[PDB]
Symmetry: C2
Subunit: 115 residues, 2 copies
């Protein structure tokens, strides 16, 4: 895949998703955020997901609502600006994380295990 | 305005816009892009617009379509990754550019005047 086809895949898999925001937050393990700009959902369940999965991407004021819902549902949210940005631009929703984001995502999930 | 209200304003002014992509490209002076990721429209007309105005923001595969339409309509497109990103995150559509982007936007418009 060319960068162009990657961009088509990203847009398509965003558009085909049929989940509301609460459902997306609730099914996530953790939210990686850049406050007021980005929220990315990550799902990782040992022996279910072979790798962390990106569940959602929201932006701007939607991040406020994600924070409100995450608090209600007991999903932790962490400020990781570079990871949030990289996943925003490069990840495909409902797919495993890109290789380049493995190290940073594992660091978040070690934190999550401690939480 | 707090960063939170800025994010609400960005999202609102995006949602209230009622223009299609061709109309947005056609009314722009130049498109600032990060290929396969971002396209931002800029309008600047001396004595009409006191400052450059952000006309649109598109992402992912939509950038391909913006490039196709820009070619048809004679609107130049320039790769400026840092400016495209900064406008993506911080600018309000249908408003003048943020102060921090004045220098980089003026550089693009000097180029445009030469074109």
């Amino acid at each position: 895949g060319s960068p162009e086809i990657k961009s088509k895949r990203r847009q398509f898999h965003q558009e085909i998703q049929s989940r509301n925001m609460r459902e997306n937050v609730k099914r996530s393990s953790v939210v990686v955020a850049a406050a007021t700009h980005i929220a990315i959902g990550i799902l990782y369940k040992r022996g279910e997901t072979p790798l962390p999965l990106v569940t959602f991407k929201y932006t701007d004021a939607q991040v406020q609502t994600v924070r409100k819902i995450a608090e209600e549902e007991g999903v932790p949210i962490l400020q990781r600006i570079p990871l949030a940005r990289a996943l925003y631009w490069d990840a495909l929703v409902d797919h495993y994380i890109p290789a380049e984001q493995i190290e940073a995502t594992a660091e978040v999930l070690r934190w999550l295990e401690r939480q």
